Enzyme design. Structure first.
Site, mmCIF file in Angstrom:
data_model
loop_
_atom_site.group_PDB
_atom_site.id
_atom_site.type_symbol
_atom_site.label_atom_id
_atom_site.label_comp_id
_atom_site.label_asym_id
_atom_site.label_seq_id
_atom_site.Cartn_x
_atom_site.Cartn_y
_atom_site.Cartn_z
ATOM 1 N N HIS C 27 -4.236 0.178 -1.089
ATOM 2 C CA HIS C 27 -3.038 1.005 -0.752
ATOM 3 C C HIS C 27 -3.096 2.300 -1.226
ATOM 4 C CE1 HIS C 27 -1.367 -0.620 -4.474
ATOM 5 N NE2 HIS C 27 -0.687 0.503 -4.515
ATOM 6 N N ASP C 49 -5.965 -6.415 -1.284
ATOM 7 C CA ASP C 49 -5.559 -5.006 -1.365
ATOM 8 C C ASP C 49 -6.270 -4.341 -2.168
ATOM 9 O OD1 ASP C 49 -3.599 -3.136 -0.884
ATOM 10 O OD2 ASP C 49 -2.311 -3.410 -2.651
ATOM 11 N N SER C 101 1.132 2.922 -9.354
ATOM 12 C CA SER C 101 -0.048 1.964 -8.789
ATOM 13 C C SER C 101 -1.413 2.292 -9.539
ATOM 14 C CB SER C 101 -0.027 2.111 -7.371
ATOM 15 O OG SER C 101 1.300 1.514 -6.890
#
Lengths: 46, 81, 149
Positions: C27, C49, C101
């Site tokens: 992502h 992911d 992230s």
């Protein structure tokens, strides 16, 4: 009196060719379902 | 006349064309083409499904290889180097 | 071992050299801010992911060995100490924001334990949404109502 729409004869031979078609369709349908099943297994795993 | 022998196999099948006709065979050919398309669509779907299976294990790190054989022809060849 | 993903000159997440692969959350937008790493060919994996590639020989000495081993207690991360319990990593709400992230959650021996993807705010504390290793395979824990950082 003839003069009508078929189909008609010639059995056997006719079946020989017919049997060749549609089997692969069943295969890919089953494979599709199996892929869905595995996908659901992954979904459950998550 | 135009004898419409039975077979066979097939062979005779085309002989009937002469008997009751113009048409007949062309429609059957179209049906066969449709069947081929269904067969081709199934194969295309199957390949996409095979990708869907090799997915997850598409990132990295040991773990097949492994199930990559037994493994629907890719699987491998694929695991490797 | 930690490298930063930049996007339009802005740090979006991180990339990590774990094992013999080079990881970075799928992502995360941008490209690893390192020549050698940026030119690699990554294999995406939407289930995890994750998005891994292989570490160039000249950097393999720079990898970090991860771990499935994570006993209830406190873990380490850039902004402080994460807390693990009940199968959930949490932190004091406010200590993690969008743009965090990719940041790893290390233990006290340096083993990366999880990789932050975002967090769900549940009051005093925020339950983190992370990518964590199972018995051997990768996994993703996403608390109800997570806000993808």
């Amino acid at each position: 009196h003839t003069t009508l729409g078929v189909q008609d004869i010639s059995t056997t031979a006719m079946s020989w060719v017919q049997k060749i078609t549609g089997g692969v369709g069943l295969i890919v349908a089953v494979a599709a379902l199996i892929l869905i099943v595995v996908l659901c297994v992954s979904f459950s795993r998550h | 006349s135009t004898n419409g022998t039975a077979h066979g196999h097939p062979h005779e099948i085309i002989l009937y064309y002469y008997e009751l006709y113009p048409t007949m065979t062309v429609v059957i050919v179209s049906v066969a083409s449709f069947v081929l398309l269904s067969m081709v669509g199934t194969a295309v779907g199957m390949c996409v499904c095979a990708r869907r299976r090799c997915i997850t294990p598409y990132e990295l790190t040991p773990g097949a290889t492994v199930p990559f054989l037994l493994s629907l022809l890719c699987c491998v060849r694929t695991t490797k180097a | 071992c930690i490298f930063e993903v930049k996007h339009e000159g802005k740090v979006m997440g991180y990339a990590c050299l774990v094992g013999d692969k080079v990881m970075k959350p799928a992502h995360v937008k941008g490209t690893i801010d390192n020549a050698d790493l940026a030119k690699l060919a990554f294999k995406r994996s939407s289930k995890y992911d994750l998005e891994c590639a292989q570490i160039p020989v000249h950097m393999k000495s720079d990898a970090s060995k991860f771990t499935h081993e994570k006993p209830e207690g406190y873990y380490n991360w850039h902004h402080g100490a994460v807390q693990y319990s009940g199968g959930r990593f949490t932190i004091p709400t406010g200590a993690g924001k969008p743009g965090d992230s990719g940041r790893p959650i290390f233990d006290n021996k340096g083993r990366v334990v999880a990789i932050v993807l975002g967090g769900a705010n549940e009051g005093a504390r925020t339950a983190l949404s992370v990518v964590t290793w199972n018995k051997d395979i990768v996994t993703k824990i996403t608390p109800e109502g997570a806000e993808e950082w």
